[PDB]
Each structure stands twice: as structure tokens, then as C-alpha cells.
Amino acid sequence: GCPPCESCHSGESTFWCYWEALCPPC
Asked: Of 12, 9, 6, 5, nearest to 21 (Cα)?
């Protein structure tokens, strides 16, 4: 499950966005 698109891709503190990174934008 991809968390809110406000994070990840140079957004907020990246927890798994540098690792899994499978979080498409809204």
C-alpha cells in the first residue's frame, strides 16, 4: 500500500521511499 503522496519522492522524511519506492503519486 502506497502511503499519502504528500510524502515520498523528495517529500517529508522518507522511511521506505528510498527502499521500496513503489509509491505512485495521487
From this structure: 9
Grid coordinates belonging to 26: 495521487
Q: Enumerate residues 6+ apart whose C-beta is below 8 A from 7.
A: 13, 14, 17
Residue appearing with cell numbers 517529500: 11
Tell me how far apart the alpha carbons of residues 12 and 26 are, in angstroms, rounded to a whole number.
Answer: 16
Residue type, 2: C
d(CA 14, CA 7): 7
Extended strands (E) in 1-26: none
